[PDB]
Enzyme design. Sequence first.
Site, PDB file in Angstrom:
ATOM      1  N   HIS A   1       5.158   7.128   6.229  1.00 48.92           N
ATOM      2  CA  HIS A   1       4.932   6.595   4.886  1.00 48.92           C
ATOM      3  C   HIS A   1       4.634   7.764   3.926  1.00 48.92           C
ATOM      4  O   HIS A   1       4.491   8.928   4.345  1.00 48.92           O
ATOM      5  CB  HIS A   1       3.764   5.576   4.873  1.00 48.92           C
ATOM      6  CG  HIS A   1       2.468   6.135   5.377  1.00 48.92           C
ATOM      7  ND1 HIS A   1       2.046   6.062   6.680  1.00 48.92           N
ATOM      8  CD2 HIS A   1       1.493   6.816   4.723  1.00 48.92           C
ATOM      9  CE1 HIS A   1       0.868   6.681   6.766  1.00 48.92           C
ATOM     10  NE2 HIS A   1       0.505   7.154   5.587  1.00 48.92           N
TER      11      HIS A   1
ATOM     12  N   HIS B   1       3.375  11.182   5.698  1.00 47.92           N
ATOM     13  CA  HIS B   1       2.578  11.125   6.930  1.00 47.92           C
ATOM     14  C   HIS B   1       3.432  10.500   8.023  1.00 47.92           C
ATOM     15  O   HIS B   1       3.962   9.390   7.829  1.00 47.92           O
ATOM     16  CB  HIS B   1       1.310  10.265   6.748  1.00 47.92           C
ATOM     17  CG  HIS B   1       0.253  10.884   5.885  1.00 47.92           C
ATOM     18  ND1 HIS B   1      -0.761  10.130   5.341  1.00 47.92           N
ATOM     19  CD2 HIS B   1       0.064  12.187   5.562  1.00 47.92           C
ATOM     20  CE1 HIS B   1      -1.539  10.986   4.708  1.00 47.92           C
ATOM     21  NE2 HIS B   1      -1.080  12.238   4.821  1.00 47.92           N
TER      22      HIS B   1
ATOM     23  N   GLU C   1      -2.885  13.812  -0.476  1.00 47.32           N
ATOM     24  CA  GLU C   1      -4.234  13.480  -0.073  1.00 47.32           C
ATOM     25  C   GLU C   1      -4.981  14.765   0.304  1.00 47.32           C
ATOM     26  O   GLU C   1      -6.116  15.005  -0.135  1.00 47.32           O
ATOM     27  CB  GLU C   1      -4.176  12.477   1.067  1.00 47.32           C
ATOM     28  CG  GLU C   1      -3.533  11.159   0.660  1.00 47.32           C
ATOM     29  CD  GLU C   1      -3.990  10.031   1.538  1.00 47.32           C
ATOM     30  OE1 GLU C   1      -3.752  10.056   2.764  1.00 47.32           O
ATOM     31  OE2 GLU C   1      -4.610   9.115   0.999  1.00 47.32           O
TER      32      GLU C   1
ATOM     33  N   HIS D   1       2.425   9.017   0.163  1.00 42.58           N
ATOM     34  CA  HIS D   1       1.403   8.808  -0.870  1.00 42.58           C
ATOM     35  C   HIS D   1       2.016   9.628  -2.014  1.00 42.58           C
ATOM     36  O   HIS D   1       2.512  10.739  -1.774  1.00 42.58           O
ATOM     37  CB  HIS D   1       0.077   9.397  -0.433  1.00 42.58           C
ATOM     38  CG  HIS D   1      -0.435   8.788   0.826  1.00 42.58           C
ATOM     39  ND1 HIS D   1      -1.281   7.705   0.869  1.00 42.58           N
ATOM     40  CD2 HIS D   1      -0.133   9.071   2.117  1.00 42.58           C
ATOM     41  CE1 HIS D   1      -1.461   7.378   2.152  1.00 42.58           C
ATOM     42  NE2 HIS D   1      -0.782   8.182   2.945  1.00 42.58           N
TER      43      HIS D   1
ATOM     44  N   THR E   1      -6.406   7.622   6.649  1.00 37.96           N
ATOM     45  CA  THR E   1      -6.903   7.710   5.288  1.00 37.96           C
ATOM     46  C   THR E   1      -6.874   6.399   4.532  1.00 37.96           C
ATOM     47  O   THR E   1      -7.071   6.391   3.318  1.00 37.96           O
ATOM     48  CB  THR E   1      -6.162   8.800   4.497  1.00 37.96           C
ATOM     49  OG1 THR E   1      -4.805   8.424   4.359  1.00 37.96           O
ATOM     50  CG2 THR E   1      -6.212  10.144   5.207  1.00 37.96           C
TER      51      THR E   1
ATOM     52  N   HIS F   1       0.837  -1.218   0.000  1.00 43.59           N
ATOM     53  CA  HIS F   1       0.000   0.000   0.000  1.00 43.59           C
ATOM     54  C   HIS F   1       0.870   1.267   0.000  1.00 43.59           C
ATOM     55  O   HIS F   1       0.478   2.302  -0.533  1.00 43.59           O
ATOM     56  CB  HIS F   1      -0.939   0.015   1.208  1.00 43.59           C
ATOM     57  CG  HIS F   1      -1.907  -1.121   1.212  1.00 43.59           C
ATOM     58  ND1 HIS F   1      -1.883  -2.122   2.162  1.00 43.59           N
ATOM     59  CD2 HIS F   1      -2.886  -1.458   0.335  1.00 43.59           C
ATOM     60  CE1 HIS F   1      -2.801  -3.028   1.868  1.00 43.59           C
ATOM     61  NE2 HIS F   1      -3.424  -2.647   0.764  1.00 43.59           N
TER      62      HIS F   1
HETATM   63 ZN   LIG Z   1      -1.017   8.194   4.958  1.00 44.08          ZN
END
Ligand SMILES: [Zn+2]
EC number: 4.2.1.1
Length: 256
Positions: free
Chosen positions: A90, A115, A102, A92, A194, A60
């Site tokens: 991590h 994040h 995000e 995104h 999220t 992910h």
């Molecule tokens: Zn995140």
Amino acid sequence: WGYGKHNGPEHWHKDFPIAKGERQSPVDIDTHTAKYDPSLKPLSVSYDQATSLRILNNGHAFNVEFDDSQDKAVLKGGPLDGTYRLIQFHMHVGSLDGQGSEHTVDKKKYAAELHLVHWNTKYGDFGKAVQQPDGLAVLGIFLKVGSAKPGLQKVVDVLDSIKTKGKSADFTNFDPRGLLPESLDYWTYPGSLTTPPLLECVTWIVLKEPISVSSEQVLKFRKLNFNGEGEPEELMVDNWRPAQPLKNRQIKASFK
Ligand SMILES: [Zn+2]
Ligand SMILES: [Hg+2]
């Protein structure tokens, strides 16, 4: 669950009805309707004794995990009450420079969003914290393409080891202070994780100032895979959830 047309964000509510809840994240930050709140104290980020352990690709995102047995890298101040321990960080990322984050600012999307996840020590462990409305604190940092961020190169160098889902690699002596912008001005609002389970346990602290990474650095963050070794290659790009309705929430700004 995943980020595909068949298991992506629009399908999450089926397994996690909370996807349609009152304090879901991310949200769009309308800079004009955000309330400047002077009573907000400055953030206190104490990462001088942080202890990273491993880096792993969980299918992910890539995640860097830290030893959270004691208060070594904590977050205090700002809109927080109590000390929150850094458990992991991590990213995104998008497939194009014009998407990836995000949270959006006035609808503007950034190339990526980092994040750093923290849990409230008064709850003892991470598992208990996700049962409380104030169990977590996530610091969000936007990334834009520009000059290279030396503090991220160490992560960039090791991505080769964790290309596919399930791989992990030792990643000690990594200093998270190298991920921070000059300014710690932020926006804050009550939201959720999220990604499933999407628990509404988070006090979001989104930094106003993005950091820069070179185009070469962002190119490498886009070379990871969602798939496991030996499966068709699915690049880990666009692993982000779209903005959610703010509903009955107000976003506070620590600055004017
Ligand atoms: Zn995140
Ligand atoms: Hg919760």
